[PDB]
């Protein structure tokens, strides 16, 4: 009778296609305001021609209510007008999933500067630009009522920014940066009440469908997720699984010496890799 | 006869601190170490970093490029080729930071950082591995080749006040892991060091500082080495006493729908109970 | 703004040590505090004084928590006088510590009525009035019991056959209540309670933060909060597991199969 | 030559199930077993159960006592002695259940599910250590004694409708604990057992079948078990377990300050339950 | 090219079963295999012996190999095998000690002729060949002043990490092993050399090249033995790797589970039994504490 | 009462360090210790015998035990020492095996003696005497047709457990040590004997007094190996146990840390190096997969 996101305004970047389309779907479906957010070209043409205001189409014939948005999440003043606009005209800006993004696959020695810092520019620099706009709003409100207040930041990371891959030199260092920006993030927001967390997305069931990680990004998006911050989940096919990072898996100390580079090879054969035996050592 | 005896190395930032560590030591090994830095002295300091390291028996050129601008890259590793040979070792260690909250935080703020960082790694990564798999071609055989890229532990953790710091050591990890396994087959790897006002040329060679910032130099020298030749994509934390290898990003917790929908009005139970363990399963 | 502004405790055995240190905590953070204890004009009366003295609200109690009587009517006198009982902190308990070849039936029986039964009653009592609550409105509503174990509970301890059955008997019952009561949002977890690090009052914090709204996401859990250090448990889980291979157990082969497959006294040899 | 040759046995609540293919299994092995129940089968079906025993070539006997009740435990015991000579083996098993939402659970539902688990089980074990120890101190030497609790599942880990159930079969792991490191120096054992209406002795392999743990309870009173005590083994299908219990996975200092109820949510966030993330910490 | 190319390996026991496979493997990465063996032909034809009958497989394959028929047991004889490879091969490259016995009994029935002759073959061959090449290897590094290229495979099994009933003297042969591995490795470190111990767990592998994958064939660990071996190895010694069937994987071997301080007064072995049971097995439990 | 009265126990090499302070601590619980030893006295008066001389101070102790002069590694003087325990003392219930010697060199400098000597003491000697008991208690065990007692101690060490450089022949032969101790435990488990070894690491242990600690000290591992020999360790076989200075420790032993699957196809060398690095060391990132 009551939907988890009731009364919310959530902004879902590059939501015209794939697994946006369904971030937003399932954002209104649970009684949030999506703000649908895309560029693209609708495939018919017929009505405004653009994709963004097919999903909001989607929506409103399901019951939700949403509304297109066609701002460039690469530039900061049209970033500052989104913003602004869904204070002005909803109220608030409480979700943000930022979902925009391209790829320019290709090995590095054939990849131009354009591949990469147009990647860079989408995933990171967009993913930065939203977050401090709801951060400042919110941490103005924070400051003016003395009390936490409301505030969900949902990035999207990927295997290749978790592990690499061949061909994606511009990608996975897009995708690891929203790893780093998404923990700093929890960090800073954590006294004001907002959360900033990072997912991992990729009758019937197919393993590849792109919306498969959606409900849990609407759930990380609802109050019952007040206390997850700084996480980096997993949502692909069959399996949701929470991630942990970097830990040391060996150690070895110097015993406040300087190290010796003639002598490291042997230290990290038998003390760090195991490629070598250390024998009998008291 | 040094481990690095005829290596050419290109160390970014190395007019102080860190940089300037790894500078004195690659050149200490025998490799000729091109300088870069751009910064002035109290003169430029790229200039007396070479001069210490003459001083000392060691081979240094000192370079003034702006490793974010792609031009002087390129034309940065032509000089090399052009007048040492060859260019065998890329440590990307130049970098700035621009701390604030995000909200106090401007984008030159975030863009600078990110690009002498990030962009500056990987402008210098495609200039040598172009040059390497030319080489790699034309022989039929594998080449040398060794990048060391620069991360930190905001890189890999995040940290209050570094949105752009953070953002951009982070990325560094992902490029060198995928540097790692695009380089593989003509026989180059790439690794990143976590390495964390006196000169390290200034601390007496045998006193041990926790916080000397040239402790971790003798690792990168190493992993310079050809007995490093087996070790790519790997994460390696050399702060103080511990030299560490790290691993990364890992399941801990894993539960199946089934292969029916997620419900978002179920999560909250399974998140609980299947992931972070907040409550309680009860017999199963 | 205090964490439990607005809340009602009942904290059982509040008159001394342990139990006064979670009822002035309570107390402190904004809390109505029913401080119940028995001892001596009466000491439940004189820490009603002391919560007072320093700003906060509290009332007496003399309720014998084991009589299920007057469990139900000290309940009753919660929601009549205060509002609601959002907060049952089950602290109240007696020892009575010899070897089991010493121990009467009655320091059996004792120990166990007021640390088990106590628990139970009290908790029987809010759950009726909490989910009566929750059908009347169709939703979820507050509520947070939080049970006492102790290092006896969980490992045994000599001289305590009936202490450590009564502490152990308590964590299954804040595991099941727990999944009893999650549908209708109220929380069950244990405190092992035990600068100064022999203060009684060191874990009474942590039981007004697990009693606050910020803590209504953990239920069923152990929490270890002696002294310097603060701990979370998890209980019994398999070490060692060997297969019969769908054959029954022979007894006369169960010592080898002891001693190389589960305690590792013995060796394996080579296995294909 | 059986494993229990010379021994007597007593098993409550050996009438059905499990505590029947206790006193099977038992008997099997050469042990005199006192096979106790209340219950009805026309005649009493402890002596059903003798009759069963006997016929497969064992010694029983049957016993009546309430085992809840203080002096016909006292009774059993020294009948025990005077008339098979001694009482080696102690199976506590009898119990009954009364499954109930707490808010639908009686007193008396509660009362008579711990008398017959818990004080059943203390009042069976005070008995038999007092003879044990009187034993021990007249002949300066260890004796021989075995006492195999039985908890389960829920009492281990909780379960819905069984408060009184589950409490009851934790109290016993407690009681095990706490009787082995009592009765060790005068050489006797206490292990508890978990072991999970078609009776075991008309029963191939049945995952579901109750006596699949009865060879462990024999084995574990047998001559060759002396040197364990105080365990929890699972015995319940294909499967034999050895378990062990509470132990932190998560610990942290307060810097020997008190505890602020203000800043614990940050602190069991990041530091206890992992919700949030730490970031850095040099 | 090669992994082997250039490469001189000395194989024992190479004229059956799994020798026979790693002298096959050598030999197809570029390697002049120097095939040790004893045994005779089925037929008796030419010189009767099974160690030219798989030269000759060899040599048909494209490959480049010489017999040997020397008891590797034997003191002088090994010395010699090895002087022969330096003088008609030029150097020694690799040495995979292979052959064997197996005498099984159990040991109230085992003679110790048989305990004496399975830990001769196993121990005292590897030692002994080992030793060899070590003194060669030790000498070209003097003369040339840098590391010399030097690869000696061992093989333990699954009886001499674990034991096995009736096989007292060849667990204990293979036991044997793994320490000789271990201890050369450390001591041919300085000048380069690596020093590795496989366990690789009729008819012969030549004859079953072709065939359907088989998880009981005894040639399967034959790569990972010419990996080993390769200049791509250089970095890895005194390891165990067992290739059985379908798996490679990596051993480590003995580590402490249990630890028990004494407060530095002397053990009571009246009080060890109650320390044994609830602070090293966990046979009885410690209660609080 | 002592835990070992009643038993009889041979250690061997008794005379000095380690072998002394187990003769002593197995006397002073009660047992008739057989103190075996080849070695002669500072002084020579009399016998000039070291083992007389250990004799002397466990019966002036209040101790029982004899003399014996067999070379453990010669098998007709072990056959007969075990049927001297039996004809004189009624039976042997325990044997430490504990001689050694040490002949320290790195392999290219070390002979075939230095090699075939520390074998025949340690692995021959220890392979002996347990044959040799094994043998009497079978025959014990078919007569009664119940488990008889026997305890089977064996020494290894840190060098046969992992290396060290100069003692290829010690850690070949502490290492059989080990294998020898799994496969007994497997072949006596059925009569009721145990086998363990014992890894323990100039003043006798007996001119210490009893309520001194020296970390040192060679006797702080003789109460484990007296408890071991124990009616108390029945249950405990197979097992290798360190116990020097302050820590008592239990050794587990060789098990898998990485593993990878081939796909049921033949591995390829060529492919190997990727593998290795990625798979199974771990010294290359293997990326997202």
């Known amino acids: 009778m009551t939907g988890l996101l009731d009364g919310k305004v959530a902004l879902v970047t590059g939501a015209g296609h794939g697994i946006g389309r369904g971030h937003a779907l399932e954002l ?5 305001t999506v703000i649908v957010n895309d560029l693209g070209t609708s495939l018919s043409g017929e009505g405004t021609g653009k994709v963004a205001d097919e999903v909001v189409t989607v929506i409103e014939s399901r019951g939700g209510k949403a509304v297109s948005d066609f701002s460039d999440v690469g ?7 989104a913003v602004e ?6 109220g608030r800006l409480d979700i943000v999933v930022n979902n925009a993004g391209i790829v320019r696959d290709k090995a590095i020695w054939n990849m131009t500067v354009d591949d990469f810092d147009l990647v860079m520019r989408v995933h990171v620099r967009g993913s930065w630009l939203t977050s401090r706009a709801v951060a400042r709003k919110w941490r103005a409100e924070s400051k003016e009522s003395g009390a936490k207040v409301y505030g969900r930041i949902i990035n999207t ?3 290749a920014g978790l592990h690499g891959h061949f061909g994606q030199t511009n990608y996975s260092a897009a995708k690891a940066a929203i790893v780093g920006l998404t923990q700093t993030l929890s960090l800073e927001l954590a006294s004001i009440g907002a959360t900033v967390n990072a997912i991992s997305p ?3 069931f197919d393993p590849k469908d792109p919306s498969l ?3 849990v990004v609407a759930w990380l998006a609802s109050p ?9 989940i997993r949502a692909i096919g069959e399996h949701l699984q929470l991630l942990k990072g970097w830990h040391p898996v060996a150690s070895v100390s110097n015993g406040q010496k300087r190290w010796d580079a003639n002598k490291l090879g042997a230290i990290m054969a038998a003390d760090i890799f195991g490629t070598r035996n250390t024998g009998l050592r008291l």
């Not at 209104?28 to 949030?32: D, M, V």
């Not at 606009?85 to 909803?90: E, P, V």
């Not at 019952?224 to 980096?232: F, R, T, Y």
């Open 28 to 32: 209104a479906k649970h009684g949030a």
């Open 75 to 81: 530039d900061e003043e049209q970033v500052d007008l």
């Open 224 to 232: 019952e997720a007040g206390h997850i911050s700084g996480q980096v």
């Open 85 to 90: 606009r869904a204070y002005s005209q909803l």
């Open 202 to 204: 990729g009758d019937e």
């Open 213 to 215: 990680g959606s409900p």
């Open 157 to 159: 990371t990927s295997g």
